[model samples]
Target chain A: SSPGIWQLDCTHLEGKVILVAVHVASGYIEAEVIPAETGQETAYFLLKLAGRWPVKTVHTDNGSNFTSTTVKAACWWAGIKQEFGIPYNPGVIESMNKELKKIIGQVRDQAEHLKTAVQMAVFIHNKKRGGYSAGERIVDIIATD
Target chain B: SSPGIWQLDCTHLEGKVILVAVHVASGYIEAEVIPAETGQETAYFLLKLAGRWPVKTVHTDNGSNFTSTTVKAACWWAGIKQEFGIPYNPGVIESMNKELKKIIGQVRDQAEHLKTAVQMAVFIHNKKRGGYSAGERIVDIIATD
Candidate 1:
């Protein structure tokens, strides 16, 4: 039993959709559902999204695929540090889930088809305009050597 | 019906307990009260809260109190725009109402004796520890200049 040692459960359920999320900035997130939880495979997918991103850290709620040695090794090779959150804290991903639900759930009677729907949703979310700006200033990307 | 109207309703209704809010961001809510449907008193209340922040917009549903010319004058003078949402839509304050019910309603049974209880509850809510992007955060102050 991994009790309190890590935060993810690794049971594989057939037909249960798997989701992965990455944060782009504070209060900004990107997520999607995939068919499998292959650890190295998942890490490669994550790396593809992180291309050229000046990422220093990654955080996720405890899940088996996340804690897998293969996933850990891939992050280590890429020089990224991983952090895990507490169990059952939906607050971690609730905002992303809320937006995902709004775009897909509001249109469907039964969201059993959410697996594919979420893929399409990722595209829609990317296309949408950003939300409320808490800080009233223009920020631009600057390079530092 | 005023072509452009604003409306408001409180969450609790025991004694002197009142839920006061300003869209102050949407420009549709000025000063409004249901049952009475008068803007004069509403304007007085609006001035009190708006004085606390730099208001640019206000949101409200269609209501006589919000649409009254007296309220319009106050906003024009204060450089606040009055904006409307939809009829009977309850405006944006509905979320605040729900939060109040959730926090205070969970502890206080009698709605009438909530004046002091509500104050203490708000005080505690601001001080509660919550997680943040880097660490935990709490309300610095709910009332201040």
Candidate 2:
């Protein structure tokens, strides 16, 4: 782990693409752009990510495409237990999405003007902090606590 | 079958996909783009048009697609009778469809680029026609009837 649990933060951005994975055990979070969001595309990416970690449970706020049986079945095939987050809970996906937006505007402010901001975000995220770091900055404390 | 009639026509633009529907008895018309507009799509449009012109018979040019059973079954669902124009007697539908095509074509170029043209045509078609002339005026012809 590069920068471990101390720097973990949950955030979400609107009109932007980010894949978020949270560790229910220690509250560590991982975030990056979902370059491809389709079921097939997501499945392919998920397999690559799953190969690196022993994910026991997966939780996501309801979005038609995400909650669909297609994604659920894919997770089942990967031996991941899936859970649904309560809808309308401010602490749920909305808060995550909001915090992500603010931080994106801050850390990646330049990305807003770029045409391929989403792809750039994911690329930088993976290349820089793909693993747990000891002193990495966590989620924006003001938003995702 | 209730003292009214529907009319239908189809046209092929070199490389475009379009389908149209009309209620001859009521002068109501609707058009849409389809994946591939064949006789099947024509009948689907007719079913929707039938609701708009409920209880009407339909007269169709004897084009192979128009004369297909799909259209016949559709007319049946809406309690409409089917009438076929005689060979070489497709004048009415031909002319009316031509009018629609002329209007619809005004905005048809590149797929997305045609939008502005379509909007302009809609404005013109909805409002009264506009024009002016001078030579076609009469000077004097008293009441000698």
Candidate 3:
């Protein structure tokens, strides 16, 4: 996992579903299911990232939500830059989507709900990657890097 | 942290919003915003805990939601037993509510949403308390204890 660089992508939990964020520097992921793929939802996940890590830049594919004016305003307000890949091109987070979907699928029916399944997978995936900024050691990297 | 004993409680993150479960044995917490204080919600959180901990017994106040048929059926189906406290009495989890609330309040406005604030608080609280089952180290305790 590296520092400063982050990736954003969307995967389905059976709908316009899961919004997943990955810190390319640290391999730490924060994935949760959202109501829709709206610009507001994109900004919500981005702010959550800023709360715990050094979000220097966010990279996502050229989805309408990622390019929407609402998300553009948020990035500018937060002093973070955004980068969009060519249409349908994959980024770092795309590489991890398969495993993420597998994990969420395994537990989405664990007698609970869809979002709960996403967190369980996040908890597992982040645990396997050796902790994460969202759940551990957020400022340490910024201080030294 | 003690094994086999878990505590369940509800605290407001504005409305009947935050459903919090604490592993008294580990000082690790899993808190989230729920739709309302329903038995289905209680069992949802309980099963989330069981997915990662040895939830032999759960302790909560005599709230209707905790004692509701939905929760009871889930507990029986999973072979877990529940214990209810006397009216309005405090327990292990109540002692930690102030700190949880403080953390949630400090950053609830970090941008786009409310539940995001709760997870941010949970990440900070669990990190300060030295990692948690949700983000690290789960079955190891059950296997060794």
Candidate 4:
């Protein structure tokens, strides 16, 4: 039981969708750009990312994916407790999602190279590299401070 | 003009297919998991990711997406010169794809979470975080080194 809960959400990208997961405690972010936004597929990906660190609880909206039996089975097998956010409770994950999109937009203007651009954006955010123009790459900003 | 060329390919995940783009220089990867795996959808996501970087030359196998008019138009509009690889040239990108799959397999064993697993796997590899006992978080290993 790692006293940490992760939030999950999906954002549309053209004809595709990006499923994102965030560790609320450490701000460790992970995302996958997938075609169909279904419960089975979402559950599969969510479990995969949650496996990286010790995840005891997961918070999500009452979407079919989070609420589906498929996801429930996987979550139970992994010993993860699933919690659903209320309909109106947007939480911090919403802001994180918005920030990621903005980072994509800025880096998109400069890179036009999707993977690296998004990777870099996530890196900077995770590493908290935006505060200083140029300095030591912060590795444990979220973990330490 | 930047003389960079990226190789693209597709692989199957269960019944669905994933479109992957790799930056030749940095080993940066971008992927889209789609249901249909058709040319139009592939072209749309590929172009969307490519829009973020200066893609002067894009090399690919003679896949319909790479050869389709829709992708062609997008590439042309972006001023990205497109080229095709010969039949048996399993270049560096192929190895990158293979390595990606292997990572997916290992991470999948521990983490059944689908898209985020792949995304985090790609992130770890791109960030060069597979060394040691996962002690201190390593960032910018690829970008700086």
Candidate 5:
């Protein structure tokens, strides 16, 4: 299982918000498309993703949506720790955000297209081979590997 | 006048949650006591306090209470920016949190006591004179010194 601190962040592409959660230890990636940046919607999306993984901490930028009591209560109930990043310095999530935006930018201009495009990017991101794999398959590089 | 980016944080002292908002540029402070850490409750407290301040941005840690949809809507309506901190590192708010905890520790134990104690601390923290002030008050040192 991926251990400790999954960094969470969202980006806007074609008017849709794409939320991404990265398990730092195992390189496991998850993404979802939400209608709005509301706490209830974000919480529902996060909870569904959390059910499949061992998530300890969730870190995000200092967006008020992430700082609301609704989001706080949800994280509290799920035994997840929520952390915020200072403005101007997005750190790792910035890289992820940029990559996702680039990926989504290539798709057709529609909300539904954005959703499917993010899911496709997530799929390619997890399965894409890299030098770190040392000739091994990308799937093998994750926790199940 | 206070400039942009007011960092907000809350701490538990003597069974009360004391919420504080500090203007980054002017060293102005506002605070309140909430019964619990709910987004609705926090939104109400923040809106009431924001009334007296220029408050362009609100930064805080990623407690679920702060992440709720309710809080996001409120901040959006008020044209305020909400930011979150990472789990272990809270940046500037860490200093504020530590100082508030220490101050509250020196006082008696009770809800009303905690509220008044935090107000007093906020007062002294904003206006207290020190070497950084160069003989000027802390308030003066922040923006006008």
Candidate 6:
């Protein structure tokens, strides 16, 4: 269980705001689809992260999104080491974005509801991940196998 | 924000049950104080975790503490790949325990309310950690020659 080190980035993703954080130690990720990039959403997700995990250190790009005084207060309340770096920082999040795009099926048509599609991508992306185990009969050869 | 990958373990700490989850990627930790180590507490925390973060896989010891079928149902509900390991797994928790002990202070008295003390310790343990920053100015005094 690693603690105190988190990387988060948020920006416009196809007409919507997407906030994502990566757990550096475990390669764990959390993604959020929000209407706006205000501190309210940021602080809400921060509280959620604190409730779910101990957020002692969080690193984020300083400019694109905005966090309010209350968010800073929550920072002190959680005693988080909030730091800033270049405006666009891509770490493990690139992998998440790749997975997200794949999960969303990369539809070229603008008719597709991008918001709903990304939200669905988050749910699918967070679903369980693993391969099949050894539990089958003799004559169960499939095409993929 | 790491999601869906979590490690949780719980047992008696003093009098009440203690439960903890570590986000391995970021070293983020969440500790809980419960009345019992039953799966009810387990499921509740899992819900809380899923709400705050995406939980895809969870690893826990098979025995010692028990989780009810409801917990297992919750596992499937969240589509968590719950895995079992040796009876005891003490990965990053040892550090938390050491910090917890220090936060509680090494009191050698049985009269202390272990429950309340540990609860307080959790609250205090999650508080901010840092050294003095450059802010408050100090004035120099005249030396007596």
Off by over 4 Å in 2: A1-145, B1-3, B84-90, B109-145
Q: Best TM-score goes to which candidate? A: 3
- TM-score for all predictions? 0.35, 0.37, 0.55, 0.47, 0.42, 0.41
Given the true complex, what DockQ would model 2 score? 0.01
Using lDDT as the measure, name the better of candidate 5 and candidate 6. Answer: 5
Q: Write the per-residue lDDT of candidate 5 for residues B14-92, one digit (tens) a residue.
A: 5767777666654545566667767766776555444323356776665565688767765764567764332346265
TM accuracy, model 1: 0.35
The top-ranked prediction according to lDDT is: 3
lDDT of 6 by residue, B1-145 (tens): 2334567777566677778675543334566667877866686567555533446677664443335775775566556666443235534545665666676564324213454344445545443243311110000000000
Residue A59's C-alpha lDDT in candidate 4? 75
Q: Give the alpha carbon lDDT tens digit for every residue of A29-106 in model 2.
A: 345444446664444334333432344445554444445565565466556554433233445434434543554555
lDDT of 6 by residue, A42-145 (tens): 76566556544456677675544435775675566556766543235534556665666676665324214454445445544544344411111100111011
Better of 2 and 5 by TM-score: 5
Least accurate 10 contiguous residues by lDDT in model 1 chain A: A136-145
Ranking by TM-score: 3, 4, 5, 6, 2, 1
Per-residue lDDT, model 3, residue A118, is 75
Candidate 3 is graded, for docking, as incorrect
Q: Could you arrange the candidates by lDDT from highest to lowest? A: 3, 4, 5, 6, 2, 1
By the TM-score metric, which is better: model 1 or model 6?
A: 6
Fnat of candidate 6 is 0.02
Q: What is the C-alpha lDDT of each candidate?
A: 0.40, 0.42, 0.64, 0.59, 0.55, 0.53
Error of 4 at B14 (Å): 1.6
Residues A116-141 of candidate 3: C-alpha lDDT, one tens digit per residue: 67766766665452443332332334
Which of the CAPRI classes, incorrect, acceptable, medium or high, describes model 6?
A: incorrect
- Whose TM-score is higher: candidate 1's or candidate 2's? 2
Poorest 10 consecutive residues by lDDT, candidate 3 chain B = B131-140
